[PDB]
Coordinates of C-alpha atoms in Angstrom, one line a residue:
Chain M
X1 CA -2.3 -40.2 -19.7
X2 CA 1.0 -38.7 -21.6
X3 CA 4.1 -40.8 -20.5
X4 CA 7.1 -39.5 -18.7
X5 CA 9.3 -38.0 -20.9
X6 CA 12.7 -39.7 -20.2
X7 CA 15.6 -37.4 -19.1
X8 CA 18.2 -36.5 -21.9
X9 CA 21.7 -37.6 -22.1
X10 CA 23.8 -35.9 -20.0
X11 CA 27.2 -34.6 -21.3
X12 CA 29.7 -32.9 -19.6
X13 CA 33.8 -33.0 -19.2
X14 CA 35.4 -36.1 -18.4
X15 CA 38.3 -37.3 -16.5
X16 CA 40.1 -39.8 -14.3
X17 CA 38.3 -40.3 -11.1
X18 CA 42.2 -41.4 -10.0
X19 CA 43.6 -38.7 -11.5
X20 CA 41.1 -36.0 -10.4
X21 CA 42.3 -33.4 -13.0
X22 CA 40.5 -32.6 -16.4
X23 CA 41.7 -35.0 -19.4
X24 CA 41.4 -33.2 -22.9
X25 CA 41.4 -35.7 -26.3
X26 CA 43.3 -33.9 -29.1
X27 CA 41.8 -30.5 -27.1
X28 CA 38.2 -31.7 -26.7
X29 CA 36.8 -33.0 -23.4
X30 CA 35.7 -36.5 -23.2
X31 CA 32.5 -37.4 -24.1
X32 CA 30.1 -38.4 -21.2
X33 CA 26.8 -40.7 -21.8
X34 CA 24.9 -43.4 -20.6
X35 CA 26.6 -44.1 -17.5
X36 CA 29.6 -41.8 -17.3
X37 CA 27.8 -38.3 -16.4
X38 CA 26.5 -40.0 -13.2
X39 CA 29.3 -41.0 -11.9
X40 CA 30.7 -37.8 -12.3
X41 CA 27.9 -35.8 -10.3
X42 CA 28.2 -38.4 -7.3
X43 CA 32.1 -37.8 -7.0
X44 CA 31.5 -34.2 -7.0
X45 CA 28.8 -33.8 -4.6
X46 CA 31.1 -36.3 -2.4
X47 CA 33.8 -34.7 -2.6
X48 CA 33.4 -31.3 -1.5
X49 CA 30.5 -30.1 1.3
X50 CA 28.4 -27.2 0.1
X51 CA 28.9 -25.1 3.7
X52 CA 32.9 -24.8 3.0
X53 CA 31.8 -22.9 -0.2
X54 CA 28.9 -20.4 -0.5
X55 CA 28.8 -20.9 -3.9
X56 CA 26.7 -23.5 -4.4
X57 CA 23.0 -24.5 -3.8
X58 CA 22.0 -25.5 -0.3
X59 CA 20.4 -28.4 -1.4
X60 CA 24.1 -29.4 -2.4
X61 CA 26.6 -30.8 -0.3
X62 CA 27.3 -33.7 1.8
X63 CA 28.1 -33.9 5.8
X64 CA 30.3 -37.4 5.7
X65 CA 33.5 -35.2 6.4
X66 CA 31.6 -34.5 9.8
X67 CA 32.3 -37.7 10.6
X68 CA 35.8 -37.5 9.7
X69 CA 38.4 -37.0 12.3
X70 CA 36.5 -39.6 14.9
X71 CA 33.9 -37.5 16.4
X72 CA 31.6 -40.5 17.4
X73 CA 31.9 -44.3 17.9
X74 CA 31.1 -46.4 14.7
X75 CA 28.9 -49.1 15.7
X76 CA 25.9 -45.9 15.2
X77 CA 27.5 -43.8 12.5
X78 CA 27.7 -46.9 10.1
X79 CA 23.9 -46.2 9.5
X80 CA 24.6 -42.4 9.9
X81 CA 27.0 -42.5 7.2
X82 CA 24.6 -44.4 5.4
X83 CA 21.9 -42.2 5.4
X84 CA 24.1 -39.5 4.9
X85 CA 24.9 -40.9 1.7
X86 CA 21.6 -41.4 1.0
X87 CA 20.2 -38.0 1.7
X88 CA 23.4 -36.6 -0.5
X89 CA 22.6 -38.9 -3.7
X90 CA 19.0 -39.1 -4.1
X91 CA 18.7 -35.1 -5.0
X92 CA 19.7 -36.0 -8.4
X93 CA 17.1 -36.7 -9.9
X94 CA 18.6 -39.3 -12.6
X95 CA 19.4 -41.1 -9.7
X96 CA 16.7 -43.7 -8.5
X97 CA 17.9 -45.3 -5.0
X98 CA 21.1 -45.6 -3.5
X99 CA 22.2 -48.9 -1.0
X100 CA 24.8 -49.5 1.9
X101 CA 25.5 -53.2 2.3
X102 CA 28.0 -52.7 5.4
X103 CA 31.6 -51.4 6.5
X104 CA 34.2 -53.0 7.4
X105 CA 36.6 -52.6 10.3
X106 CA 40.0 -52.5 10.1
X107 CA 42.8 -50.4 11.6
X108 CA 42.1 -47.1 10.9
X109 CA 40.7 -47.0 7.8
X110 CA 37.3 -48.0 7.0
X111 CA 35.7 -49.8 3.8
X112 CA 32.1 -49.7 3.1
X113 CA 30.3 -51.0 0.3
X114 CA 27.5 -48.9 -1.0
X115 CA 25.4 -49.4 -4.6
X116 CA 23.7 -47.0 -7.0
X117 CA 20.8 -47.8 -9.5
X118 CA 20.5 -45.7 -12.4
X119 CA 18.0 -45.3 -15.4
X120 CA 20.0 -46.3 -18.5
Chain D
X1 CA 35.7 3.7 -20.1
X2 CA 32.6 1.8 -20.7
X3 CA 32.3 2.9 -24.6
X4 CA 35.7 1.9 -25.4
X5 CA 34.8 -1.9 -23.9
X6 CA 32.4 -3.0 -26.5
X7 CA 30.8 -6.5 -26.8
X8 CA 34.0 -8.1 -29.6
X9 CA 36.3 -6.6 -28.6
X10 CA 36.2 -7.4 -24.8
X11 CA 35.1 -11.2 -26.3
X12 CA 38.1 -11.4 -28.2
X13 CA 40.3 -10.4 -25.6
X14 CA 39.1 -12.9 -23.4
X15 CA 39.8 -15.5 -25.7
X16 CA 42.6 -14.4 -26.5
X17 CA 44.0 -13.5 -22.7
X18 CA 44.1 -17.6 -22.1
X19 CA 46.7 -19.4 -23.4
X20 CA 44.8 -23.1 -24.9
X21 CA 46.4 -25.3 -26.6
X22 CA 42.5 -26.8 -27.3
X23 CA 41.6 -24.9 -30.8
X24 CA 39.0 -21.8 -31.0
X25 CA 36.4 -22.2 -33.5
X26 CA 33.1 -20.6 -34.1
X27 CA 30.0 -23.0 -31.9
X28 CA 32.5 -24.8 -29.6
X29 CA 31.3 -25.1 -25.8
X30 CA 34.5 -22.8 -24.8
X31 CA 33.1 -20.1 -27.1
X32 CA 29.5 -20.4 -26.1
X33 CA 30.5 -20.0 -22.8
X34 CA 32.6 -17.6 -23.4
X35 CA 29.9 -15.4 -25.8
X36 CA 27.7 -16.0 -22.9
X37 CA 30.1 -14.6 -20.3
X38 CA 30.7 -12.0 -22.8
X39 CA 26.6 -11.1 -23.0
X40 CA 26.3 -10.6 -19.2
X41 CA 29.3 -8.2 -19.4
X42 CA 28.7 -6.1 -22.3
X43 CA 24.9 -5.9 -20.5
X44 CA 27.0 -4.6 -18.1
X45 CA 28.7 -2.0 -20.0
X46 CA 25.6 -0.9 -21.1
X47 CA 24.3 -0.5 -17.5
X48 CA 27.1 1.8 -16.6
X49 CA 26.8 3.5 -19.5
X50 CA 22.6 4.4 -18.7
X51 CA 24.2 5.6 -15.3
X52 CA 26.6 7.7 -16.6
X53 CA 24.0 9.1 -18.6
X54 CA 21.8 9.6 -15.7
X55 CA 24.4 11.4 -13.8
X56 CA 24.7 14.1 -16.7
X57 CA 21.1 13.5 -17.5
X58 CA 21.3 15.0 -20.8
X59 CA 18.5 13.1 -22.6
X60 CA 16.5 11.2 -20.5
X61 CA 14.4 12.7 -17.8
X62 CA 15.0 11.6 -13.9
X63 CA 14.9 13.0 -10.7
X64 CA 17.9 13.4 -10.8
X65 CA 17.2 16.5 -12.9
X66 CA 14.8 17.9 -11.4
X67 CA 16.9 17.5 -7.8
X68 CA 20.0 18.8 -9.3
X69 CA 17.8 21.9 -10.6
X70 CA 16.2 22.1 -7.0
X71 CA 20.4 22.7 -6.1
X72 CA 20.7 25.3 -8.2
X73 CA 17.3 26.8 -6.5
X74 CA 14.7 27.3 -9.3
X75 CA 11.5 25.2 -8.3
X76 CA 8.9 23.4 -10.0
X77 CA 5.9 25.6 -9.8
X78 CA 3.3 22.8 -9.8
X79 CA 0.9 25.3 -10.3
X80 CA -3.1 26.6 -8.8
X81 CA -6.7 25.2 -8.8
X82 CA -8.8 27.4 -10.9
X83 CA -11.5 29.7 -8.7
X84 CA -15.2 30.4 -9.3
X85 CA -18.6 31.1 -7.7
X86 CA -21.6 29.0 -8.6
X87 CA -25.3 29.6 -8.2
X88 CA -27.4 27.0 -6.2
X89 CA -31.5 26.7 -7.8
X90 CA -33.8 24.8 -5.4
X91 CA -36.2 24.8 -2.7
X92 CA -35.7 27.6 -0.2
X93 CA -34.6 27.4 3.3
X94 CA -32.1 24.4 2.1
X95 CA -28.4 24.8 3.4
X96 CA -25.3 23.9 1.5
X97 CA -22.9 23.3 3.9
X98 CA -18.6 23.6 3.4
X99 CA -17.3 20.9 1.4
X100 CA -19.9 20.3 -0.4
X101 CA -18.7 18.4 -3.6
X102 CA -20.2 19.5 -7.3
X103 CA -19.0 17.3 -10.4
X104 CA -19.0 18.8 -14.0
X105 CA -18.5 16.1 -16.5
X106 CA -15.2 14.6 -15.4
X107 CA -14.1 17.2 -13.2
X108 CA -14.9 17.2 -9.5
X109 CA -15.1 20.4 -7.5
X110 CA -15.9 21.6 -3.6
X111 CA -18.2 24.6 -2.5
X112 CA -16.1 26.5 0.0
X113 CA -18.7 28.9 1.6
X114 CA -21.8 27.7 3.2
X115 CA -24.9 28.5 1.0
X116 CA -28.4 28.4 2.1
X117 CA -31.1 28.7 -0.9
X118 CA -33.4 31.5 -0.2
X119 CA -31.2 33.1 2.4
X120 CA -30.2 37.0 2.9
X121 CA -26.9 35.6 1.9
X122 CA -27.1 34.6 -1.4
X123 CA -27.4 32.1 -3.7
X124 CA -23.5 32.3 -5.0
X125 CA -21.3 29.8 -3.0
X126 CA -17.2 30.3 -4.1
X127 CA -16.2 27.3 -5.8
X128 CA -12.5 25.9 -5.7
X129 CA -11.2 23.5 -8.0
X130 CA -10.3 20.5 -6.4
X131 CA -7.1 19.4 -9.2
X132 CA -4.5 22.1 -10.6
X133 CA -4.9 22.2 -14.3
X134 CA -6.3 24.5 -17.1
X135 CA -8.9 22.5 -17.5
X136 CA -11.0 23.3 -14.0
X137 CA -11.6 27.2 -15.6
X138 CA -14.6 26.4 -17.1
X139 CA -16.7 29.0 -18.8
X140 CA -19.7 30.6 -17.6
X141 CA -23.2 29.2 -17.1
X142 CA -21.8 25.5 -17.0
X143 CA -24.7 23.2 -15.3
X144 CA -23.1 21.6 -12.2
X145 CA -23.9 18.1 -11.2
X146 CA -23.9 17.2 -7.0
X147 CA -22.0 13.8 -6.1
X148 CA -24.1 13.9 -3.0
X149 CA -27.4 14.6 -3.6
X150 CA -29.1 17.2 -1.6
X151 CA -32.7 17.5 -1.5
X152 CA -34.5 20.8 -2.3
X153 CA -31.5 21.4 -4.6
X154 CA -32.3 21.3 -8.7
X155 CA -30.0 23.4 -10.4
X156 CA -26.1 24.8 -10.7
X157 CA -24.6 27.2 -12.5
X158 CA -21.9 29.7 -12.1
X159 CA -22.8 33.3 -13.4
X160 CA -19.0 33.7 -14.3
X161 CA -16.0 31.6 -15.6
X162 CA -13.9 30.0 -13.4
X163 CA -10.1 31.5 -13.0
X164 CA -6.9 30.6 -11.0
X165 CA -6.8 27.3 -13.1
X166 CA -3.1 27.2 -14.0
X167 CA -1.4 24.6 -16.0
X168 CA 0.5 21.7 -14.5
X169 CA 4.4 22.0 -14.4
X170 CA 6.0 19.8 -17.1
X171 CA 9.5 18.7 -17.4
X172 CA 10.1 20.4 -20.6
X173 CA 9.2 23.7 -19.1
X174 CA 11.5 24.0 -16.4
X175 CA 14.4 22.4 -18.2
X176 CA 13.7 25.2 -20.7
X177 CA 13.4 27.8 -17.4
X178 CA 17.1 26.2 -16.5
X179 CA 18.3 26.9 -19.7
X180 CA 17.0 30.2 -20.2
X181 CA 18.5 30.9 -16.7
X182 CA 21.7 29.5 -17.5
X183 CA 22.0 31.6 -20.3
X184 CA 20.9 34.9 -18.1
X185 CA 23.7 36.2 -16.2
X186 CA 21.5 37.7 -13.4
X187 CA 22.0 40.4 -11.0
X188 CA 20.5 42.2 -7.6
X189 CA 18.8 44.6 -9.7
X190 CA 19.1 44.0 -13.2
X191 CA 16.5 43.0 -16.0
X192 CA 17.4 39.4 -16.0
X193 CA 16.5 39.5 -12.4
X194 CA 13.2 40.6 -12.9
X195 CA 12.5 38.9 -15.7
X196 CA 13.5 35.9 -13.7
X197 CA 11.0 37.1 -10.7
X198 CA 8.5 37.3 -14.2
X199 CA 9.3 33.6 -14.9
X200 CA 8.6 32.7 -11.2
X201 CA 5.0 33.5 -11.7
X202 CA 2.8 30.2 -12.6
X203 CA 1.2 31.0 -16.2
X204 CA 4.3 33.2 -17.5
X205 CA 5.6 31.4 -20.8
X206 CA 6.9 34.8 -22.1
X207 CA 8.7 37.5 -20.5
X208 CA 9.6 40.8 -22.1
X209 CA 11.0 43.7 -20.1
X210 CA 11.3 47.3 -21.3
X211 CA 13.4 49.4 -19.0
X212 CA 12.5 53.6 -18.8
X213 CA 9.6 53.0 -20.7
X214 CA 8.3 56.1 -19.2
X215 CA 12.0 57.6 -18.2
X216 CA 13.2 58.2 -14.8
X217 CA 12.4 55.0 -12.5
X218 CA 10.0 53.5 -14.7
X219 CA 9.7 49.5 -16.1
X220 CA 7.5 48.0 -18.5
X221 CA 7.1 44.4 -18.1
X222 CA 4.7 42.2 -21.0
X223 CA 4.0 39.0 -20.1
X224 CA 2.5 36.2 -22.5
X225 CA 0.7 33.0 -21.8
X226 CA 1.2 29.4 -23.7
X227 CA 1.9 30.1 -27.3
X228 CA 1.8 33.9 -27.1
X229 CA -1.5 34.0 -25.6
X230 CA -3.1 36.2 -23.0
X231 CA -3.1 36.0 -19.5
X232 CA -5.6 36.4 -16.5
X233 CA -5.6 39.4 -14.6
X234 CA -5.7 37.3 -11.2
X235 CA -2.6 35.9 -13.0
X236 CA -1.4 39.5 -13.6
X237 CA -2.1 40.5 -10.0
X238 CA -0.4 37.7 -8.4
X239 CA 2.5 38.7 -10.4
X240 CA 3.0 41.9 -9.6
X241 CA 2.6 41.6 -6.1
X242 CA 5.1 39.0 -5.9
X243 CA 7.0 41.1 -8.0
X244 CA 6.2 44.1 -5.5
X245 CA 7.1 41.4 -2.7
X246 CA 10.7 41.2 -4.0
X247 CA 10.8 44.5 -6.7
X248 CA 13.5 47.2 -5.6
X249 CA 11.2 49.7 -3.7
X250 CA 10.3 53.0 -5.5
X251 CA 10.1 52.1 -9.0
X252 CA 7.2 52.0 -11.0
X253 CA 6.2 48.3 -12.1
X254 CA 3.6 48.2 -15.0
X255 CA 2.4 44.8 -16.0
X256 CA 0.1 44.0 -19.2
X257 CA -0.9 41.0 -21.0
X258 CA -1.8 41.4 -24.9
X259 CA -5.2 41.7 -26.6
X260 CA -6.7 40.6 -29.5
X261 CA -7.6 42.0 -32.8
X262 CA -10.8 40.8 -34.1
X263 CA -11.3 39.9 -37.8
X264 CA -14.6 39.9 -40.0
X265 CA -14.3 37.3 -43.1
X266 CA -16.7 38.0 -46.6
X267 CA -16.6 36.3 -49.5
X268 CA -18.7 34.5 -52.3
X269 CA -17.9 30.4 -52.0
X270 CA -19.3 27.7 -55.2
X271 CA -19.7 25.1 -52.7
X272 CA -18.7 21.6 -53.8
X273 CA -21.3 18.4 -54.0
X274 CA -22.1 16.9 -50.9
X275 CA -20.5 19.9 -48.7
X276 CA -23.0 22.1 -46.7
X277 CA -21.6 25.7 -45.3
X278 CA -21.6 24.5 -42.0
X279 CA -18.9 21.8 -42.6
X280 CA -16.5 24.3 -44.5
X281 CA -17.1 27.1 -42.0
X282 CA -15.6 24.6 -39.1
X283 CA -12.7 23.3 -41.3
X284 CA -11.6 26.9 -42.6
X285 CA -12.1 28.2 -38.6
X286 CA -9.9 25.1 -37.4
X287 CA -7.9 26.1 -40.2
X288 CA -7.2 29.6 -39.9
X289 CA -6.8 29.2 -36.1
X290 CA -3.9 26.9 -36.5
X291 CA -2.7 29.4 -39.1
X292 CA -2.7 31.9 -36.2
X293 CA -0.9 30.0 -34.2
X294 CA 1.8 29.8 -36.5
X295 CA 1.7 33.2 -37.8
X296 CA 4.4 35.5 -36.9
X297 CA 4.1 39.3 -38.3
X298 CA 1.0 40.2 -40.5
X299 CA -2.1 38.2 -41.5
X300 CA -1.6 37.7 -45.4
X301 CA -4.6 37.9 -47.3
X302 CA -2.9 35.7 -49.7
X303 CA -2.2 33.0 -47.3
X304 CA -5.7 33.7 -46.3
X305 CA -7.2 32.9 -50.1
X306 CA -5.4 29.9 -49.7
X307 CA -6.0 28.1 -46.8
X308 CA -9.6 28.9 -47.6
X309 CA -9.5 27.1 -51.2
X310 CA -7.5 24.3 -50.2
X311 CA -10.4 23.4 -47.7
X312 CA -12.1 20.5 -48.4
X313 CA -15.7 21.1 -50.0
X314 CA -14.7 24.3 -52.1
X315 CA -14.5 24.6 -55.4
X316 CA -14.8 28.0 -56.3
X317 CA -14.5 31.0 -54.2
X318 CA -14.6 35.1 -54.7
X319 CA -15.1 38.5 -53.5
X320 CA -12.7 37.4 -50.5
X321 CA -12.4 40.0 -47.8
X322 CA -10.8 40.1 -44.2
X323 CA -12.6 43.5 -42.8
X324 CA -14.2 44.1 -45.7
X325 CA -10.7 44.9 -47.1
X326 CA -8.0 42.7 -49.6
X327 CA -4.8 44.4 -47.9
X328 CA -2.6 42.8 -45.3
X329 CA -3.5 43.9 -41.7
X330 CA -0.1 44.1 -39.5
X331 CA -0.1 42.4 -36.3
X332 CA 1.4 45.1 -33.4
X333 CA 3.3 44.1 -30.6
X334 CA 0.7 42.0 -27.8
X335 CA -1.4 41.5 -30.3
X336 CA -3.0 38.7 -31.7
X337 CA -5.5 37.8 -34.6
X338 CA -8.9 37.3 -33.6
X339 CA -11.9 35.3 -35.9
X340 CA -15.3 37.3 -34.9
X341 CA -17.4 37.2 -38.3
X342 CA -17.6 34.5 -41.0
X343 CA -19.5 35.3 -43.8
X344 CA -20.0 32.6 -47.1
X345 CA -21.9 32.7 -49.6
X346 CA -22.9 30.9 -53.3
Chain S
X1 CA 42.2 -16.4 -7.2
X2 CA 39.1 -15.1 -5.2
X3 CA 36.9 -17.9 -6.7
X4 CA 39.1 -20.7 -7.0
X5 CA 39.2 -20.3 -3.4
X6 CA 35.5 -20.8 -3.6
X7 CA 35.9 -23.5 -6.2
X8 CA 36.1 -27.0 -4.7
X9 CA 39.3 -28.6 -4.0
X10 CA 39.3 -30.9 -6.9
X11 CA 38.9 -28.4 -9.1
X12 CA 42.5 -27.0 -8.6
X13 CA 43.6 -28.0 -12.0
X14 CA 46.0 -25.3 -14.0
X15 CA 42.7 -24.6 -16.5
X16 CA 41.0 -23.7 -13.8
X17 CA 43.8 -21.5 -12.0
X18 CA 44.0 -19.6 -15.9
X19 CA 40.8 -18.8 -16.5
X20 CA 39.5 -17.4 -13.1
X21 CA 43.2 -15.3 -13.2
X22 CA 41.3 -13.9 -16.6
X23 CA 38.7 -13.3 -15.1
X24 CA 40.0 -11.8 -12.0
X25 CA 41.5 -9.6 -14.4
X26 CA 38.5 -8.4 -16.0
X27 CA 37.1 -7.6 -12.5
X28 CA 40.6 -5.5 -11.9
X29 CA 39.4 -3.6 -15.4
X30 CA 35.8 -3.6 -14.4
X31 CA 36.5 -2.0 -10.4
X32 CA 39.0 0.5 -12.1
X33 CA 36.3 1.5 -14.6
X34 CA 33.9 1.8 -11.8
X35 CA 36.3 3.8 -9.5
X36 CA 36.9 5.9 -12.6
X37 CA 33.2 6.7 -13.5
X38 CA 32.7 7.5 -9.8
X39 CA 35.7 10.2 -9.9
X40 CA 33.8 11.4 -13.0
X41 CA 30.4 11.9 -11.0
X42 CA 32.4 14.9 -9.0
X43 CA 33.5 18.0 -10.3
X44 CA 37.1 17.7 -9.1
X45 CA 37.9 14.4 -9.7
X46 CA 35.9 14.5 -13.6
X47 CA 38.1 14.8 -16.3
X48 CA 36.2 14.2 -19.6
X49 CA 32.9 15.2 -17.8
X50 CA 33.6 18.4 -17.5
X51 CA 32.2 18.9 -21.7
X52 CA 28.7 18.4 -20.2
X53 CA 29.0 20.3 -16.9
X54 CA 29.7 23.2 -19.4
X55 CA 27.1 22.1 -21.7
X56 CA 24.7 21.9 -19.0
X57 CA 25.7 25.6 -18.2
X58 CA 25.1 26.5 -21.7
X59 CA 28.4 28.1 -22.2
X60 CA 30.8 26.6 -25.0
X61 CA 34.7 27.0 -24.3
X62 CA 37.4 25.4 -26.3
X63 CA 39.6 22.7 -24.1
X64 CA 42.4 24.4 -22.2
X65 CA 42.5 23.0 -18.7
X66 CA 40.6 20.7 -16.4
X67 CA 41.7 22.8 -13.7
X68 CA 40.8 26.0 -15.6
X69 CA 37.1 24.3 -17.1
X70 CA 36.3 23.8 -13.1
X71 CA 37.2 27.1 -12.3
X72 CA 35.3 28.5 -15.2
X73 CA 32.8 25.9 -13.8
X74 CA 32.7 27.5 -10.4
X75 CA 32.5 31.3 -11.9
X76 CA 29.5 30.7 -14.1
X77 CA 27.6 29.7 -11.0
X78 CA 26.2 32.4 -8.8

């Protein structure tokens, strides 16, 4: 009968994505709400894998640099990559679903388009 | 050194250590984390403190105690099941076979000698205790219950108290026995040896040694149980022939344990409303045995007045005599005061 | 530097770099500390601990040596 209690705000340092080092204002972290926090956690658990470092949580961690360095064709690991992505976003639990729309081919490097829906 | 860290100081130097140019103020996330960081460690602190504690085990007791004792070879004497003999009451021609288990109130013992009713052999079966402890020597004519019901039996009872019961080894003991060691400066041969051989004994609170009691090759060795009390002669026996085991052959080993002087109590007592004589009888016995126990020298007759008058129920008292006399009785060497007769009066 | 080597690569900012060198340091007090206690636990290697050992034998000297309080040490036993 009770409803879900909704998840609190949560705040945490912020920074340049670009820049990837801390940013202080006048010595104080940025504040992160709403949609800032999330974005954070997703380009951390992309970033680095879990099994380089035994720090962290199993459940943690990604295996997209797997893929790196060309070890399979990419007509297959287009979806692979998408699942991958899939299975390394949805653990958070402010996170609802994630979506690839495609990847595009080009050269060497390779462009994918890939959405997140959020609570707030 | 783990005292010299404590939980500021080791906080402050932390914050301190890391040059910010981000402000330090009490709350802020830095110093929560920080006082958190801070918690863990001085928890750890403490931990190595509580070792280094253990390893001198001053305070607290561990095995680490009783193993480092156990290194320096004196051994926790855990101590003996008490000894008796029971009678067995029932239909003849029933046997009692070995093992037989017989349960007094909370204790449990075995029979160790099978016991037919009715036969040539008897109706006394030896009875061991099946604990160690003090406890298990109970007194003579206690009724016996059987865990395992035997038919033809009906009655238990031991014609004679039950011995050998000796008390438990606590921690406070031997750490006392390691002190009193550590004090004595022993020697092959010497009165601190034997003494020592004395303390090896279960039972043997008090030692006291008196060399060329009787001259030429002669020891006297007085032995005292808990508080100053008396002590079995199975206790006595076992300690001597230990002693004998180990003793220098040739001289002459005499051991004792002290006896008790009996008193006889007369006086005329005003009894106060609502108090009958059997009430203050009890309270003035329970006091004037704890006076005993923490009597050293001669029973005062003084003292003894008052511990009677400040018992509850009396009011006004006369015509008080121990042994029919007023005068202080002295209290010899292994001897202790002994109530036998109480005699009140209105 | 041990756990910034565990830390992820983004994380290789200078803040990061100063406070796990604190905190290495601490550990450097912390092992030393250890080490020290555990050269306490013996005899020879017990400096300080000595005051119990000889209050453990239940004689009471005044400080001269730590080589002369283990010898003493050593004596009072058998």
């Amino acid at each position: 009968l009770p409803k879900t209690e909704e998840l609190p705000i949560f705040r945490e340092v912020a920074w340049d994505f670009e820049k990837d080092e801390p940013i202080l204002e006048k010595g104080d972290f940025k504040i992160i709400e709403k949609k800032e926090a999330l974005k954070v956690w997703i380009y951390k658990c992309i970033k680095t894998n879990r099994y380089e470092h035994e720090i962290y949580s199993l459940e943690y961690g990604t295996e997209l640099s797997e893929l790196i360095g060309q070890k399979y064709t990419k007509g297959l690991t287009e979806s692979e990559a998408s699942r991958f992505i899939k299975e390394a976003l949805l653990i958070n639990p402010y996170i609802l679903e994630v979506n690839v729309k495609s990847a595009n081919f080009n050269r060497d490097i390779l462009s994918a388009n890939v959405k997140v829906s959020t609570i707030y | 050194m783990y005292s010299d860290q404590t939980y500021e100081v080791i906080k402050n130097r932390t914050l301190e250590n890391i040059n910010l140019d981000i402000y330090k103020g009490e709350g802020s996330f830095l110093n929560n984390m920080v006082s958190g960081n801070n918690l863990e460690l001085s928890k750890i602190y403490l931990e190595l403190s509580k070792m280094h504690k253990m390893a001198f085990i001053q305070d607290t007791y561990n095995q680490f105690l009783d193993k480092r004792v156990n290194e320096f070879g004196v051994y926790r004497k855990l101590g003996t099941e008490s000894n008796g003999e029971v009678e067995f009451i029932g239909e003849k021609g029933t046997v009692i076979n070995n093992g037989t288990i017989i349960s007094y109130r909370d204790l449990l013992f075995v029979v160790i000698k099978d016991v037919t009713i009715g036969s040539e052999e008897g109706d006394n079966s030896p009875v061991q205790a099946l604990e160690v402890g003090k406890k298990y020597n109970l007194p003579t004519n206690c009724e016996f219950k059987l865990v395992d019901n035997i038919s033809g039996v009906t009655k238990i009872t031991n014609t004679r108290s039950f011995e050998g019961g000796t008390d438990i080894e606590t921690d406070e003991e031997l750490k006392e026995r390691f002190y009193k060691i550590q004090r004595n400066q022993a020697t092959s041969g010497n009165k601190a040896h034997y003494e020592e051989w004395a303390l090896e004994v279960d039972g043997v609170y008090n030692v006291k040694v008196y060399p060329r009691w009787d001259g030429p090759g002669t020891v006297k060795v007085l032995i005292f149980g808990k508080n100053n009390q008396a002590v079995d002669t199975e206790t006595i026996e076992r300690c001597q022939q230990h002693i004998d085991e180990e003793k220098p052959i040739g001289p002459t080993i005499t051991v004792v344990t002290p006896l008790p002087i009996e008193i006889s109590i007369s006086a005329v007592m005003k009894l106060e409303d609502g108090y009958t004589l059997d009430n203050v009888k009890e309270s003035f016995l329970e006091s004037i045995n704890t006076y005993f126990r923490d009597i050293r020298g001669e029973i005062i007759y003084t003292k003894v007045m008052g511990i009677l008058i400040n018992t509850t129920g009396v009011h006004d008292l006369s015509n008080l005599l121990i042994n029919g006399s007023t005068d202080n009785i002295t209290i010899n060497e292994d001897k202790i005061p002994s109530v036998t007769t109480v005699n009140f009066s209105e | 530097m041990k756990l910034i080597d565990k830390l992820p690569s983004f994380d290789r900012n200078y803040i990061v770099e100063e406070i796990q060198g604190a905190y290495d340091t601490e550990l450097n007090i912390l092992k030393e500390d250890i080490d020290d206690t555990f050269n306490q636990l013996f005899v020879d290697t017990a400096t300080w601990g000595l005051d119990m050992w000889e209050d453990i034998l239940c004689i009471e000297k005044k400080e001269l040596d730590f080589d002369t309080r283990r010898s003493n040490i050593k004596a009072k036993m058998r």
